[PDB]
Amino acid sequence: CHSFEEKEMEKQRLLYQQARLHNRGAAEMVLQM
């Protein structure tokens, strides 16, 4: 999971990468562990 337009693009890329994991149940696993 690691210019205005560039900042927006970086934000969207990070959101997509985080969604890849949190759409499959990572947060509940973290809390349980």
Cα–Cα distance for residue pair 22/5, rounded to 1 Å: 25
Q: In angstroms, what CA-CA distances link 28 with 6, 10, 24? A: 32, 26, 10
Give Dmax over CA atoms of the chain in angstroms.
40
Using DSSP's 3-state secondary structure scheme, residue 14 falls into: helix
Dihedral angle of Cα 20, 23, 26, 27, to the nearest 10 degrees? 120
For residue 26, what are its two tokens? Answer: 């990572």
CA separation for the pair 25, 28 (Å, rounded)? 6
Method for this entry:
cryo-EM
Which of 3-27 are b and which e, b meaning 16 or more Cβ less than 10 Å from the residue's Cβ? eeeeeeeeeeeeeeeeeeeeeeeee
